[PDB]
From a paper:
The T4 bacteriophage gp41 helicase and gp61 primase assemble into a primosome to couple DNA unwinding with RNA primer synthesis for DNA replication. The domain architecture of the gp41 helicase resembles the bacterial DnaB helicase13,14 with an NTD and a RecA-like CTD that are connected by a linking helix (LH). The gp61 primase is composed of an N-terminal ZBD and a C-terminal RPD that are linked by an 18-residue flexible loop. Here we report a series of cryo-EM structures of T4 primosome assembly intermediates.
We hypothesized that the absence of the RNA primer density in our primosome EM map was due to slow ATPγS hydrolysis by the WT gp41 helicase. Therefore, we utilized an inactive gp41 helicase mutant with an E227Q substitution in the walker-B motif that abolished the ATP-hydrolysis activity, and assembled a T4 primosome with the WT gp61 primase and the ssDNA/RNA primer substrate. We separately refined the helicase and primase regions to improve the resolution. The mutant gp41 helicase region had a resolution of 3.6 Å and revealed a structure essentially the same as the WT helicase. And the binding energy of the two additional DNA nucleotides inside the active helicase further stabilizes the active configuration. This binding-energy-driven transition hypothesis is supported by our observation that the mutant gp41 helicase, lacking ATP hydrolytic activity, also adopted the active planar ring in the assembled primosome.
Numbering used by the authors:
A (entry chain D), B (entry chain E), C (entry chain F), D (entry chain A): 1 to 432
The structure:
DNA sequence: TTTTTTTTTTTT
């Protein structure tokens, strides 16, 4: 029914107002229909009005396509004529036609991706998406229903807004009291929280301590280590949970009986979730890789995480920018934005680590301007905490956590407090 | 499109009043088109009015043509109808047709000049110009645009200019006396206004404060969130309007009774406007999306916004340049130009935020050179204020606002003024 | 007469010494002639001497030519002979032939340009000059001659040097005596003058001050703006000439009676010109449009320009390069060249205002390595000034001018001088 | 080519004496070419002289030749002419022919060696070299060059080198006795020599003086100015040559009669050179534009300079640095290297000027450490004279010349000398 | 050819 759609795009102002915002060039044909719609779209972009038959003929004469295409477009334009119709049958039929064409294009692209990925490398016609984003494309084929959400009205829609304040399902409480106090109830789902410490100051000890604390509070935690292996992170978690020093495990001061007893005692407790550690090579995982990991975890292991942790965003690969194409600023900003998009998609608290510049190392204070790889990371991150350690603090078994970007509350209040990091047990303890 | 031009010359006075000044027999053709235009020109010269079909046919009978030309003119005259096409498209198309025909005639003329130059001096014609007249014959053919307006005169139009001085309909007050004082009556419609600061300083706080202030004045405000979600921002607007807190909303200190009472009391006010909050994924919107959103808003609800707030220009996506086609100085400036064009098209006050590079994130002052993105943004901008907060300022809850680019008024009359920013209420308070 | 040219290039020495530096491969037809000239040129480049017949037959055998090309070149070489003629008819005939070939090539190139322009976007060739570049090409072809001036030859060009000593070019005086001192009487007719400055520091203030000063001297001034409405520029001029602050005009302190009285008092003065302000959209005007504008200004308004002032060079259209085709440097250089050509053609002092880079903003000193868009502007310009009102000159109500490039005198004599900028009246007063 | 080689072996002497030692029978052919060379070699052996074409025919008349060979030889002998080709092209072309034939023979020999190697060991030729001899054989093919000149060979070019020391082949005198004394006979070709302008001490005056002494000695001088026009520099040259004061020309004291008389008096003298002044914009002339200028002057003006004087090194631009700066060290170091490379590749004496540190300005003594260009100019400069001015030197019309770097001779021999500077005539006179 | 981030280095 392409002829009817074009005719009522021309000879119906009411029809054009609703269907146009959604009409696209890939929904008609590879011949006369697409060319006619391209003519109409160019005229609309140039004059912001629906062209007439004379305007279409003039644009057709000032066009460069061949004789066959010219004749087809001329016949199609000559066949366009308004008919007595009703707005509803046309809008519903157009929605059905657009949905069918979107599904057809999506399945054609799916077949193309499958037949392209099944090719020897270096001859796979790059810039074509991989099989990993096969379902997502189909998800885009179903989100076309002529029902775009205009937005949220402050006065018209306030009961629904008020039924989001006492819900509190968005906030995931910590286990430390100070972190809950500064965040006013803990971190929120669909966010990107960051730890900035430097090199060998913490920043993975803190992530492991957070993972252990969330695990004790009945949470499913997905640790993703882009550098350290799976047994080192698991060893850190074991040291945190079992209250056994990493030196004791290395020096064999803990027996198999004690280890088994502690593990079974933790297992028999109802207030304990599941922690899963996954390792990827440095620069070999992205947002799409994490989504594939999420899907295979949900299917194979029936594991649905809420506290997804990534060891370092700077070590991950952007899923949109080719490697080493853009500078550190753009690449890191894109990676952080994609991670935040993943977090809001799966509705999980995302925790990450970030390096500071060389000038901030061995300094008694770390500012937000000391971020290493990009200034956009603080802009695209919900909460950031700076971990500072000096010789005096190290001798006191304490670290100073400074609130650098506090989006859940006022950062001026409680800006710097001293945590009791214990490096042997990979644990954070409070001083209150 | 000679038929359209002749038909709208005869049957349209508005078209005749803008194209007849620039029209010649050489522009049309050498056959029936030129003869028809010559008949029209002869009739308008003998009688100062546009001829009719009957008068044109009578003149054709009076005038003498050979059989072929007579038949061609009769056939062409038979093909004239009103056909009320758009005026803008018609004038643009006739300008293009005139330009292309003039270029063709100029090329033929210079080719004839070159051919005559090679002839021996005895054989060559003295009427044709020398080769030295080739260039100006070309530039003049490139100065046949349709524009009869010459511009202001400063001595013949001072009365109209004085009347224009009294047209203050472009101004929009600020609800803040200091901002009105420094803008000489508030912001103006169709202008790009920017509120820039560092990361986590209160850019979105200022945007929401401006939205609430415009809402309390009866304006229609369209808040477009790029990083935050739609609901979170409405909470800030509620904290500004209801004037309780941000934490008290999340800590349950407000019962439903008070919330309902305050919302209904604000509904009873006749000085309140309409506020719509729209969220977009990072890097997925521009004026092209904004124009479709405007059309959908106007269709679905009686909402034509007077104020358009964009959460951040940087997070926005340029229309023509791809996601990472060019560097920051280009696409950021392109987005700024597109936003200003959208504002001047919709005649709305456009507000947006801008980021500051790391060099001024901890400085007591910020200059125009401290713009994180392209420096073309402080070229398309009109009132680029700046927010500077220090430890002493945060102690007194008083952000410093520095006038960075002031196109409305004197940038240095009140260069730096203190505000009374309340972070809990997301409100700017004037200081007296 | 290609055969004669080749024959006397090979067999004659004075002819070779006279005509060789001006010969080019494009002056010969694509048959045997161009290939033979290629062989001759390669031999001359490799051995710095005129080849013989044996040399070329050796070069022909050691060449990658097809059978047809080989046969044609061999036949042409066989046909060459030393016909005795006079070395005063040969040189002029060769010059005529070269000029004709250059004109033919230019005609073909402009025909190709016009064919390329009419093609739709995404199919048309890029980097090919637009239609507005056609006359310039035709200006280059007519300049071909066997006489070339590379540098100034002492003892060979000394009459012209004595003329330059004794004669001085006519100057359009300023009203500020300091500019006359630094320019030795003012600015010449066919010049491009630029007043670079930072953003929101007085680019339009200085241009409007110059426009008012020239208007008070009896000149016809055309003010073309792109970032400002006609009423705004005319209000700046009124503030300059009526001695009323822009604050007074906006606030309504002055009445219509006083305004009319002052305007009529200015009208009654005989030493007054005509100032016409024309506004164009950003990127919507070029040199041809300025020419079309000057055309209607000379016709509709019957006004001949004298001090054409382009508010901003960086906004105007290229007129030689398609929009968004080349980089900023090339486009701005092309705009500068087009504007200077327009000034030379119209014999009008042309004043403009470019923007300095972000580094020069709030910098107490600027140099040629501070221009933002293009560093080729000083080469095209004839006088270039700067504005250095950075931090403390604004508090003292003063400015500073660097004199970056002054072709009228010596830049290192009064390089930096202080200007009393008054922003309420939008004028420059002298510190003397 | 073989016909030409044989013809110019028979009918030339220098070509024979140059190419005979590198001529072998296997280089020509297996029919006419080889047999004909065999005749030349045979005769050259029995009678140590070149045979007459008839004597070569006598060789054919008295030699073992098959009917085809004897005929072939007769035709080839009858096809040899005494035509006069240029010697350089002939030698180069016969060298290329010999090299190609030697390479072909060596490749065929190694192919035959490989083919013989892949044969039954009982059945193979013993005379064929083993496979291990293949790399050496090709070497003998690559070691074929009519003339071997790779660098300067000590103990093999000592006689030519002595002729350089006695004839002072590299020195260019100065016309000033003191400058000749400290340079052991003047500056050398392929060198960069700079004068360290101090506190407003000078600006082109010295280089203009150097552009007159060389002119009076018969040298072709190319003066490239950046901060001045051609007329101004040539006026400084006229002041020095015509003894007219610089201000007298501007005032008009000297009339056209005296000027023309002095110019013609200079033109009569045969000891006068040519001066070509070329102007370039500031920063618009790298040391690659100078190469193009030299090529144009050689091709069109036939002007091949021996002295190149650049007005100022700092004003110049680096050929491939992209970013230019008003006063940056990296650019000055690159500019010096590029200019010295130009001097070396053009075998010309290159002169330029550069600024020095304020300390060098305040102190009468200037140290290499006290130089604006540190480790950049006293590293790429063969000679660096420090021209500084003092009020006492000024009151006596003198300038103290100090020698800061002298590759030519000992720097401490005559380091300080007083120069008689005349600022009106722009001249340097000696002091007794 | 400019523009902007980050880093590292070096020169004054
Ligand atoms: N096996 C271990 N036994 C005891 N202490 C350890 C051990 N591993 C690490 N630590 C301590 O933990 C501190 C911080 O460890 P990490 O969390 O690995 O630092 P890091 O910042 O993650 O390293 P990078 O540079 O970011 S990969 C170190 O400085 C050590 O003092
Ligand atoms: N929900 C909140 N509760 C309390 N304080 C907040 C909240 N959100 C933001 N703030 C404070 O508001 C200030 C700036 O935060 P925002 O206004 O959200 O920043 P923004 O303008 O979005 O800029 P960035 O660069 O994106 S953080 C800081 O003092 C924050 O701590
Ligand atoms: N209405 C006004 N009243 C008083 N002063 C004003 C007014 N408008 C502008 N100014 C002042 O004039 C100065 C120069 O403004 P402009 O003439 O627009 O300079 P500009 O370089 O053209 O700015 P652009 O075009 O946005 S880069 C500003 O910095 C203000 O201080
Ligand atoms: Mg780590
Ligand atoms: Mg923000
Ligand atoms: Mg301006």
């Amino acid at each position: 029914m392409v002829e009817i759609i074009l005719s009522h795009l021309i000879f119906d102002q009411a029809y054009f107002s609703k269907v146009w915002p959604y009409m696209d060039s890939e929904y008609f044909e590879s011949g006369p229909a697409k060319n006619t719609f391209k003519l109409i779209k160019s005229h609309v972009n140039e004059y912001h009005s629906v062209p007439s038959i004379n305007a279409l003929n003039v644009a057709l004469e000032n066009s460069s396509f061949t004789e066959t295409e010219y004749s087809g477009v001329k016949t199609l334009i000559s066949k366009l004529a308004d008919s007595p119709e009703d707005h509803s049958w046309l809008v519903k039929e157009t929605e059905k036609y657009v949905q069918q064409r979107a599904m057809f294009n999506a399945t054609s692209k799916i077949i193309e991706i499958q037949t392209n990925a099944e090719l020897p490398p270096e001859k796979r016609n790059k810039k074509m998406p991989d099989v990993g984003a096969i379902p997502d494309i189909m998800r885009q084929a179903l989100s076309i229903s002529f029902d775009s959400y205009v937005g949220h009205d402050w006065m018209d829609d306030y009961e629904a807004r008020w039924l989001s304040y006492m819900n509190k399902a968005r906030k995931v409480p910590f286990k430390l009291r100070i972190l809950n106090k500064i965040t006013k109830g803990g971190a929120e789902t669909g966010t990107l929280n960051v730890l900035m410490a430097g090199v060998n100051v913490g920043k993975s000890l803190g992530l492991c301590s957070l993972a252990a604390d969330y695990l004790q509070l009945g949470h499913n935690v997905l640790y993703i280590s882009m550098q350290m292996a799976e047994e080192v992170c698991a060893k850190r978690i074991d040291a945190n949970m079992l209250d056994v020093s990493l030196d004791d495990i290395d020096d064999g001061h803990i027996s198999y009986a004690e280890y088994k007893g502690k593990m079974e005692k933790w297992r028999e407790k109802s207030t304990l979730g599941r922690l899963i550690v996954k390792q990827y090579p440095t620069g070999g995982a992205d947002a799409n890789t994490f989504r594939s990991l999420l899907n295979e975890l949900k299917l194979k292991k029936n594991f649905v995480p809420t506290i997804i942790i990534v060891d370092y965003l700077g070590i991950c690969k952007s899923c949109r920018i080719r490697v080493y194409s853009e500078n550190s600023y753009t690449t890191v900003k894109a990676i952080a934005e994609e991670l935040r998009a993943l977090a809001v998609e799966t509705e999980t608290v995302l925790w990450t680590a970030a390096q500071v510049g060389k000038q901030a190392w061995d300094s008694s204070d770390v500012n937000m301007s000391d971020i290493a790889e990009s200034a956009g990371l603080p802009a695209t991150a919900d909460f950031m905490l700076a971990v500072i350690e000096t010789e005096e603090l190290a001798a006191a078994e304490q670290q100073l956590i400074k609130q650098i970007k506090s989006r859940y509350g006022d950062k001026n209040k409680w800006n710097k407090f001293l945590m009791g990091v214990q490096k042997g047990n990979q644990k954070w303890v409070e001083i209150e």
